[PDB]
């Protein structure tokens, strides 16, 4: 066994669709990107979707639309990927980190209330492993602190509150109380990066739920303008703002079209693998995050586990013992304050003890659609034997 | 029959290379991007090349490596594409626009000297249509104003002068006094966008000429770090069998090139000398066609320059703004797509809103007023060129009194 962590799942159907684009007159943004956006909108139950070159691009663009900028604050969990936070610093806003709960990755929503100020413009929860956050709660928090809010831009007037922007890089296809991810938070960004559930090798999207206060075409145009240098017998164009360059090509969209056709089948397989893993670890010290709750049906992107009674050293040893057995594994995630970039900005790990405690004993097992049932069986058994073995 | 301005030139060889990447374990950055960077470095005579997802990305990262920022100034010509200027505002620097000469797109190098201040960190000349700028002159200017300069970052100490950063979006393959574009200016960004000479549909690169004061590996690593979220991994974690552990040194960007785009680039680069030759043949046919007429093309062959021949920029003698715009619409009625390179930056809403005023760059405006760009791409047949030549001549004269 040599089990990789997240190989891409690409078949001939994807290759023929890309080849088709390469024989067309449209190799960058064109008809298949528009078609992809249409079909993703239907899938996520949103009116419009903007397809871009990364989820990092989408998330940033969302901030840029809301015109979040210097002196504004944006709240992120301490336990997340660097990308959710980096974009806050790109627009010149100030990140505010919120520690997490004891038995989940989700922010402590009391600490979230306490973190909110008159500067607070946006909250970016992360839908880690595909597991969507407690949005009933999150929407209660922003309504509750709604008098703190003052709208300093066009779109901030439309909402008269903190905008909730979902980092659903892991959560295309997840649902919360039966609704698709993308239709829950005010804005949502998705990732189609090589290692994600749905891939275009590099890509992503921004979308937003139906809301009477948003003209959808106008919002789409605004995203488009910012993604293509601010540009608006037809030679003549103007440039309204010296903007960015993060459009999606029809090469990536071709991949996306086919992935989206195959996607219900990929999800089902990831359900089967997660359920086998779940049975395997029941009764053991290995405690997976739950992909099926009363409110959530996860996309089942990552098999996040934590090992009861493991220290930092013991965890790091377990991972290296897993690789000796031919099992690649990962850690999601170092809390942001462990990272040099965020220490240099004054964030300190001792302020987020729960985030640190989640990270210390966390191990992510392979969860992708090229795993065989026998490989899963092998992972279950080896992980159990290796954990117990890590001993003195 | 209807002639497009810039269709992409893609063959089966490109398609088989992309398919090959799509069957590999590497669909984003991987072995073919590294190989592309290696082969482009050889082609441009530079030690290293960083392949990215746009020339806009490359140009901005060059500025971010030089740590050009708030309170610094960066000089660009008034006659250029918005991308050359936008990246200045992205790093928080202040753009300074310089008007151009009377008979070419190049900046007026006297006005350039006059524009330079103690804040001036970078000059971004544009190699318009593939025509490389007068770099002997440009380097004379920055040496001449070298006492104005004070170095407020690591790489600004390495140079102790204004850094010259070539916008060669149009100029992969162009040469200035026999040297490739990329080896002339201090840094150079290239574009592999769909409509460019060499395409990856979307893409580009940053490179830099050999200079004793630059550790090339260190400069590469710095670009790489900024293109991939600031992520690094130490020697220890890389050696370990499970190499999970990484640090993030700076909350950086996301503009790496995939091996899908690199696959395109590898094949394009093989086919490139042949694409260049064809663009030479088309330009020469056009050149003969317009000789003696009121249609005046920019020259792709000078005593110092052999252009890549990316755009057939022309200006029509004695045409006003209205007459030009009418000529272009008459060209489309005849089935000939055409374009304008470029509206001077100060005509654009974004740059007016930042206080730039068109009346300060009268030569830039005068270049734009009567400029028309004809199709110049490797899907044009000789008969289509013949047709363009004749129609453009007849339509221009038609537009009389
Ligand atoms: C991968 C990832 C992103 C950014 O995705 P890209 O498409 O690579 O920009 C953002 N957030 C999270 C949680 C991720 O895992
Ligand atoms: C197209 C272009 C750019 C930027 O190219 P991308 O690869 O689209 O970022 C920059 N400068 C000039 C002159 C261009 O034509």
Residue numbers in the entry:
A (entry chain B): 4 to 235, 245 to 404
B (entry chain A): 4 to 404
What does the paper say about this structure?
Spr1654 is involved in the early steps of TA precursor synthesis, where the first amino sugar UDP-AATGal is suggested to be synthesized by this aminotransferase, followed by several TA biosynthesis pathway steps. The three-dimensional structures revealed that Spr1654 has a fold characteristic of the type I aminotransferase family. Each Spr1654 subunit can be divided into an N-terminal arm (residues 1–14), a large PLP-binding domain comprising residues 15–276 and a smaller C-terminal domain comprising residues 277–404. Two dimers, composed of subunits AB and CD, are present in the asymmetric unit of all the obtained crystals of all forms of Spr1654, with a buried surface area of 2490 Å2 per monomer (15% of the total solvent accessible surface area).
